């Protein structure tokens, strides 16, 4: 009853104010648990009313934070699960609900295996004495690299992300496992690119065009890789896949307080200058060489088929 309502609220405000939970895998787990509790703790008999209330609460979620697309695309996954179950039972009400629940359960148990799947897949993409470059921080990519490091020796060049220098803690984490790690400013990306073999980077969201929304500055790294023709690898699980297209959407970049870019102590100039701090940026699919997912490697030119396999095309608007 009101527990469900206040938990939905709590989650909405946690998504709105700050980043909670930090890992987007934990965010997917939390939103899936909440969707399960909603579909269990409501008086819905027909699948249509359930889908409608799910779409409404998902609209509220998406309005809470548009840049966090995992919640929305997993809501769409739940909607596709409901559609599949209704087609199975109609192409049956209690069995409907329990079958939806076991579908969500299998989705959740395969959710925690994507990390291990990518880690296992990592070995056949790294050779000895290779030079990797990565930008920012990504749990999936550091797991990739520290799993490849157990049987291979290679160098990782971590380009810090300004202003949020998450790349520093990533470099430290990689050095923990003895992965020879060079830390540099993002300004030195093109200068060092000539000596890099591969580029491995995570992402925040993959669009239907194949493009991906990743931390700012990664588009420049992709342009450098394309200039030097080095393969650019994206190790992104299959819950960051978003059916929306690049310019049919709104609110792509996430702008945070310019205090991160230019501090308050600069004084009077802060009334004359316009400071901008875009967290995310757009990378076209032409600059991506290969996508690594929990199922296996795929070219950017197959992400649309993955969409068709994951999301109903009438639910791309929620």
């Amino acid at each position: 009853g009101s527990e469900l309502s206040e938990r939905i609220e709590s989650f909405v405000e946690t998504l709105k104010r700050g980043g909670g939970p930090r890992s987007s895998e934990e965010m997917a787990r939390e939103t899936l648990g909440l969707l399960r509790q909603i579909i269990t703790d409501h008086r819905w008999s027909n699948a249509g009313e359930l889908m409608e209330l799910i779409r409404r609460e998902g609209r509220r979620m998406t309005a809470a934070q548009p840049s966090e697309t995992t919640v929305g695309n997993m809501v769409r996954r739940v909607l596709k699960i409901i559609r599949e179950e209704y087609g199975r039972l109609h192409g049956h009400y209690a069995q409907l609900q329990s079958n939806i629940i076991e579908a969500i359960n299998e989705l959740l148990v395969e959710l925690e295996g994507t990390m291990e799947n990518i880690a296992a897949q990592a070995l056949e993409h790294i050779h000895s004495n290779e030079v990797i470059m990565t930008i920012g921080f990504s749990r999936t990519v550091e797991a990739f690299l520290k799993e490849a490091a157990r049987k291979r020796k290679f160098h990782v060049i971590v380009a810090e992300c300004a202003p949020f220098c998450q790349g520093h803690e990533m470099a430290v984490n990689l050095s923990k496992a003895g992965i020879e790690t060079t830390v540099m400013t993002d300004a030195a990306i093109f200068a060092v690119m000539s000596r890099v073999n591969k580029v491995i980077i995570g992402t925040k969201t993959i669009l239907a065009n194949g493009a991906l929304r990743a931390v700012t500055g990664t588009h420049t790294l992709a342009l450098a890789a394309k200039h030097h023709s080095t393969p650019l690898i994206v190790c992104a699980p299959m819950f960051k896949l978003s059916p929306q297209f690049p310019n049919e959407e709104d609110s792509f970049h996430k702008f945070v307080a310019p205090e991160e870019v230019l501090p308050f102590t600069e004084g009077d100039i802060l009334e004359k200058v316009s400071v901008h701090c875009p967290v995310f940026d757009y990378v076209p699919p032409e600059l991506i060489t290969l996508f690594i997912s929990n199922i296996g490697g795929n070219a950017p030119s197959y992400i649309y088929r993955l969409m068709s396999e994951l999301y109903h095309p009438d639910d791309h608007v929620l």
Partner: protein, 357 residues
């Protein structure tokens, strides 16, 4: 004798041939206070360089020329010796001390080469004092023209290129670019300048303050977000630290990246430079010849958790901040000099013309 500076930190393997120094551990702590091996002005300038108080290329060259004036002014020829060879021989330890405090820039190298050429050109029969002040006047004339007249000419040439209501993107601190923009705004042009900056030096705040003091509308963002702002930018203006024989632009580390992204965004790239910064040297990458600053500058003060605090305690962790990078000549469109507008293809031709050929 001046001792060698200990190379602080763990160098990246590819840059093992370059020296890496620490700002804290200076070089004058093993020298006599009333310095005799090194001229007082020269040790003063070396200490100023090492601490980073003199940063700009033009600033470094001008400080070098003033210290050299102070040196030659106080120089006295020993008996049974001629000034021509003795002075150029005595200037070498000072240059070595400088390059140990901080690697010499292209402007400094060219200035020292010209000064040695002039000293060797001093007449054997000439007396001492008028030779000394002739050297002083030659240095005054050289710096005067090659700095201020070059700046005025380049400012006029760039003003006849900047149009009304156009967005110009600048990177880092450069006296020439700031002067160009200030003169263009004063002359009557109405534009806005986007300032791009990069860690850890954050030298873009300098040109930002200059533009705001000049009244030019300005915007600020760090180099990773350059891809987001280039759609608005109408033109990229940069300040070169060195222009090599092949036309490549040797300048701050973030210059080639910006040129690449601008080319990707169909934004013409302009670089402003003087003829005295042209160098017959040539390189194809930022690895053969570069400068490694103190790696401790990479550490970010993110409140309560500095992640790279004890980076040396991690065996497999390497830190590196490159001070220079090279832009291939095909990523740059214009080079604005005293002679006017030229393609990067024509840099060695200008070098020849300035070789009195």
């Amino acid at each position: 004798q001046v001792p060698t500076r200990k190379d602080y930190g763990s160098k990246v393997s590819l840059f093992s041939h370059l020296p890496q120094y620490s700002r804290q551990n200076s070089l004058t702590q093993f020298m006599s206070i009333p310095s005799s091996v090194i001229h007082p002005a020269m040790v003063r300038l070396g200490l100023q360089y090492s601490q980073g108080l003199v940063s700009g290329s033009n600033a470094r060259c001008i400080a070098l020329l003033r210290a050299l004036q102070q040196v030659i002014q106080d120089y006295t020829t020993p008996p049974n010796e001629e000034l021509s060879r003795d002075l150029v021989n005595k200037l070498k330890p000072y240059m070595s001390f400088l390059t140990q405090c901080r690697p010499l820039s292209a402007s400094m190298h060219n200035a020292i080469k010209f000064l040695n050429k002039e000293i060797t050109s001093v007449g054997s029969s000439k007396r001492e004092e008028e030779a000394k002040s002739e050297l002083r006047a030659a240095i005054d004339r050289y710096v005067q023209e090659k700095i201020v007249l070059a700046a005025q000419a380049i400012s006029r040439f760039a003003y006849q290129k900047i149009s009304n209501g156009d967005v110009i993107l600048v990177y880092g601190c450069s006296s020439l670019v700031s002067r160009i923009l200030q003169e263009a705004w004063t002359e009557g042009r109405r534009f806005r300048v986007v300032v791009v900056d990069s860690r850890p030096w954050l030298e873009g705040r300098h040109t930002l303050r200059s533009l705001v003091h000049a009244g030019v509308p300005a915007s600020y963002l760090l180099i990773p977000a350059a891809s987001y702002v280039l759609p608005e930018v109408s033109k990229v203006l940069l300040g070169a630290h060195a222009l090599l024989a092949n036309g490549s632009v040797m300048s701050r580390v973030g210059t080639a990246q910006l040129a690449l992204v601008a080319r990707a965004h169909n934004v013409p790239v302009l670089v402003c430079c003087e003829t005295y910064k042209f160098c017959e040297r040539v390189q194809t990458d930022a690895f053969v010849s570069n400068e490694l600053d103190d790696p401790d500058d990479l550490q970010c003060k993110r409140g309560e958790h500095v992640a790279l605090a004890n980076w040396q305690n991690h065996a497999s962790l390497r830190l590196l901040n490159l001070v220079y990078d090279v832009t291939p000549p095909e990523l740059v469109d214009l080079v604005i000099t005293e002679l006017g507008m030229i393609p990067c293809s024509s840099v060695p031709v200008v070098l020849r013309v300035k070789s009195s050929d």
